[PDB]
Structures are given as structure tokens and as C-alpha cells.
Design a protein around this ligand. Structure first.
Ligand SMILES: Nc1nc2c(ncn2[C@@H]2O[C@H](COP(=O)(O)OP(=O)(O)OP(O)(O)=S)[C@@H](O)[C@H]2O)c(=O)[nH]1
Ligand SMILES: [Mg+2]
Length: 336
């Protein structure tokens, strides 16, 4: 008797990172042979970040010849060759000469100005983590760490599942892609679900979708949440909402106000120290998700539960705490 969990949310909300985190905490885990199979993915992510930075820099220079966005002509050439390696079908791991050029691109001031506009780009979140550590990833004896695996970015396009045990209870969690094209595939997974883990990126409120750059990422997340809550298969199904990327949110909400996002235009920032500002904004986002849940659950908590958790999917301590909080909530609530 196996309780089925279903990871849902829009693209890059964090579902696969949570999926790996579950493998790390409740099973083994990785997996040195399978860790090495992530080297090509990590290299691909690096090549893709340089490509998007280099192309975005060139476009930002077209709009503005200040020129805050004009690269050193040397790094303009290096940026072109490195991006053409990524686009090639050949193979080409990142060796020492590659890492030296990538590092040199990443250090150009125009690239860092472009990187400060990552929200206007479609830049993988792991960009700064991997580019800063490009020399380590280029060594011939390099084995990815478990931290590397959690940062590595693979756009999910199939169904994956893993079973795990805690207490005497068996679980099977399913991972599926969240980009628009992959959502046809959700419908047949909707049966026999004991709980939906709905991932929602807190840090996305100043970004537009990869599938449609006219659509705010967070508006899409909230419409998507409402559309899942309104599906008949989930009428009496529990929702655990992971308000993920809390680490990124902490930095962003201090520098980009929430009102940049159309669903947060009524936000009124309080004054105080960094943590009262962070805390107040998070409570405000939580209330908004709560409102969507209440609007769509006539019998509220006697129909289905909806618990909200701020999370950082990369961080095992925060994840271990988050899952223990779930069990602590179930014990106090007398729910089985
Ligand atoms: N800083 C930070 N990065 C995160 C966090 N969660 C996920 N990421 C990073 O964001 C990237 C995208 O996350 P991912 O798990 O692949 O999203 P997804 O929901 O599975 O995306 P898709 O399969 O529907 S396209 C990954 O590279 C991951 O490392 C987080 O909480 N904080
Ligand atoms: Mg995924």
C-alpha cells in the first residue's frame, strides 16, 4: 500500500530539484557513477549560460551604446567561439582552455552588467554558481558533488518516479515537466493522488515565461495553481505548497519591489530591518496563495488541506526541516 505524491508547478519552479532532494534525504542517493553522468549536463548548462549572456549583452548594446554593455573585443570573440561549441552537435567537454575563456568572459564588466539583467534574459539559475566554479568543473578528475547535481538544470520532458520509505510508510513521488507543452501529460497522473506538492517560485515575480515573454512568471504560477485546484480529480486531495527559491527571494525583494508584478500591485512595503521586510513580503504572498485556495475549496479544511511552506530546494537542512514540519503539522492536526 503505497501513497502517491505528485510534483506539480510551472517550469523551473523547482520540482526536479525537490525530486533529487527526496532521493538524497530518504534513500541513497548518489551514486558516483550516476554523479559522473551529470558532467555533460553541467557543461551544457555552462555553455548555455555563456550563450545567453553573450547574445543578451549584444542586444543590450544595440539598445544602449553608453556603452555599459560593450564587451572587450577579446571577450566578444571568446564569447562567440564558446557559444558555437555549445550549439555544435559534436560533444566537446569543458577542458582547461575552455574554462579559462569562460572565466574571462564571466569577468568582463559588460557581461556582469548583462548578468544584472538576468530577469530579462532566460538565464539558468545555476549560472553564477557554475561560472564562478568553472575551473573546478574543468579538471580531468572532476566528479560532480551532490550540490552540483542539485544546481544542474535539465528541462524535464518525461515522467519519472521514485519510491521511498519513512516510518513504516511507503511513498511514490512523481516528477513531471511544468512548461506549457508538458502539461498535457499531467492529466493521466491525476488519479489516486494522496497529496500534490505544488512548487511555486517566490523569486519569479519580475520575470516572464520562457514559453511566452509577454507573460509574467508569477501570474502564470497563480493561474496554474487555480487551474489545478479547480480540477475535479483534486477536489478532496491535499496540497502542500512549496514556495520555493526562498533564498533568491530574500535578496530580490530587498532590491526589486513586489509591485513590479501585476498580482502584487497592491503591496505596501513596511519599514524596518531586512528581516521584517523579508518576513512581511513573504506573509503577503502566502495570504495570496491562501486566498486562491479558499476561493476554490467550498468546505475549506474539511474538504482538503492546503499548507504553505517557504523552501529552498537546493538546501538539505531547509528541506529536511520542511518535511519534518509536514509530519509535525499532521500529528497536531490528527490527520492520517
Ligand atoms: N537558488 C535556488 N535555485 C533553485 C532552487 N530550486 C531550484 N533551483 C534551480 O533552478 C533550476 C530549475 O529547477 P528545476 O528543478 O529543474 O525546475 P522544474 O520545476 O523541474 O522545471 P521543469 O522540469 O518543469 S522545466 C535548477 O537548476 C535548480 O538548481 C532554489 O530553491 N533556490
Ligand atoms: Mg523538472
Amino acid at each position: 500500500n503505497v501513497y502517491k505524491l505528485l510534483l506539480l508547478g510551472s517550469g523551473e519552479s523547482g520540482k526536479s530539484t525537490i525530486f533529487k532532494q527526496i532521493k538524497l534525504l530518504y534513500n541513497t542517493g548518489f551514486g558516483v557513477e550516476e554523479l559522473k553522468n551529470y558532467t555533460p549536463v553541467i557543461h551544457a548548462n555552462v555553455y548555455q549560460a555563456i550563450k545567453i549572456l553573450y547574445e543578451g549583452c549584444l542586444d543590450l548594446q544595440k539598445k544602449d551604446v553608453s556603452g555599459e554593455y560593450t564587451m572587450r573585443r577579446e571577450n566578444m570573440e571568446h564569447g562567440k567561439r564558446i557559444a558555437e561549441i555549445g550549439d555544435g552537435v559534436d560533444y566537446h567537454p569543458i577542458g582547461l582552455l575552455e574554462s579559462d575563456l569562460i572565466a574571462q568572459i564571466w569577468s568582463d564588466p559588460a557581461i556582469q552588467a548583462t548578468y544584472r539583467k538576468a530577469n530579462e534574459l532566460q538565464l539558468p539559475d545555476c549560472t553564477e554558481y557554475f561560472l564562478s566554479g568553472v575551473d573546478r568543473l574543468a579538471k580531468p578528475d572532476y566528479i560532480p558533488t551532490e550540490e552540483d547535481i542539485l544546481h544542474a538544470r535539465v528541462r524535464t520532458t518525461g515522467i519519472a518516479d521514485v519510491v521511498f520509505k519513512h516510518d513504516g510508510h511507503t511513498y511514490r513521488v512523481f516528477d513531471v515537466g511544468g512548461q506549457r507543452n508538458e502539461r498535457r501529460k499531467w492529466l493521466h497522473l491525476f488519479d489516486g493522488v494522496k497529496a500534490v506538492i505544488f512548487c511555486a517560485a517566490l523569486s519569479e515575480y519580475d520575470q516572464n515565461l520562457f514559453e511566452d515573454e509577454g507573460k509574467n512568471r508569477m501570474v502564470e504560477t497563480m493561474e496554474l495553481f487555480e487551474s489545478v485546484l479547480r480540477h475535479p480529480s483534486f477536489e478532496k486531495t491535499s496540497f502542500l505548497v512549496f514556495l520555493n527559491k526562498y533564498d533568491i527571494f530574500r535578496k530580490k525583494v530587498l532590491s526589486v519591489p513586489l509591485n513590479v508584478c501585476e498580482v502584487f500591485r497592491d503591496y505596501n512595503e513596511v519599514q524596518g530591518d531586512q528581516e521584517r521586510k523579508i518576513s512581511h513580503a513573504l506573509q503577503y504572498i502566502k495570504n495570496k496563495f491562501d486566498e486562491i485556495y479558499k476561493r476554490n475549496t467550498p468546505g475549506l479544511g474539511t474538504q482538503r488541506l492546503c499548507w504553505l511552506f517557504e523552501t529552498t530546494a537546493l538546501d538539505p537542512r531547509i528541506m529536511k526541516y520542511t518535511f519534518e514540519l509536514v509530519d509535525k503539522n499532521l500529528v497536531v492536526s490528527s490527520i492520517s
